C-alpha cells in the first residue's frame, strides 16, 4: 500500500511539473517570435523540440496547431502536416482531441499508450497540453510511466 | 521515521538531477538566437527570458556569471551584477561564485548556500547547478529552494503518513 499511494503521488507531482516546464519553454520560444518572422520563429520552435526529444530525457514534446493539425511528432512522423483529429494511440484513445480539449479548458491532460521512438513498443504516457497564444500552437509536455519508475527507483529502494 | 529521512534525501537528489536537464534543454534554447544575433543581443534575449522564469517563482530560478566570475544575472543581489563575484558570500559563508566556477570546470556539479528568494527576503538553504554552456560562453546555474522542494512533496509526504 505504501508503495501503490508513493507511486501515485509521484506521477501527480510529475504532471504538476509538466505544466510549469511547459510554461517555461514557452516563455523560452516567446523570444524566437519576438525577434524572427512567423515562419522562422515556428521552425526554431520546432528544431529546439527535436533536440529536446533527442535528448532522450524526462519530456519529450508534441505539438498540434488548433485545428488538430499535426505540427510535430517525431514518433508518428507520417502524421506531420495531416490532421490528427481521427488519430488513435494503439489503446484507443484521440489523443489529438485530448490535446484540443485540455488547451480550451485552459491546460490538462490526456492519458494513452504509445511509443517513445518511431517502431518501438507502445508504453503508457500522458500529456500536458496548453494553448501558447503567441505562437498559435497547442504544446504537448509529455512523459512516458517507465521514465518516472526510472527517475524514482533510488527513492523506491530506500523506502524498500 | 527513518523513512521520511532517507524519503527527503532521495526527494533532494532527484531534484540535483532535474536541474542539470533543466539546464541542459535551456542552453539548447538560447542557442537558437545566439546562432543568428551577436552577443550582445542573444545575450540580452537569453537574461530577458531568465528574468521571465524567476518571476515565474517556480521550481528553479537561474543565476548566470561569466568564466571569470563577474555577475551577469541574479535578480535576489541586483548589486553584484556587473561586478566580479568572486569574493561574494552567502550569510552562511558560502563563496557561491566560487562554487558555481569550480562546479562548471568539472563538467557541471553542486553549490550549496542560503540565500533569500527576493531581494530584501529572508534567507533559505538552496542549491545550484551550475555548466559552463560554450556557445554562450556563461555559466548558467539552475538553483531551487528546499522549502521548494518540500512544498511539492507534501502530498506524497502526507501519503506516507
Known sequence: QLMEHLETGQYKKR???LAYMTKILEQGIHEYYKSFDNDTARKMA???FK???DDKGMIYM???DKNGVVLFDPVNPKTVGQSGLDAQSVDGVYYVRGYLEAAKKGGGYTYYKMPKYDGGVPEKKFAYSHYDEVSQMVIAATSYYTDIN???KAIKEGVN
Open 51 to 53: 533536440r529536446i526529444n
Open 150 to 152: 526510472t527517475e524514482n
Open 62 to 64: 508534441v505539438v498540434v
Open 15 to 17: 504532471e504538476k511539473t
Open 46 to 48: 520546432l528544431d529546439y
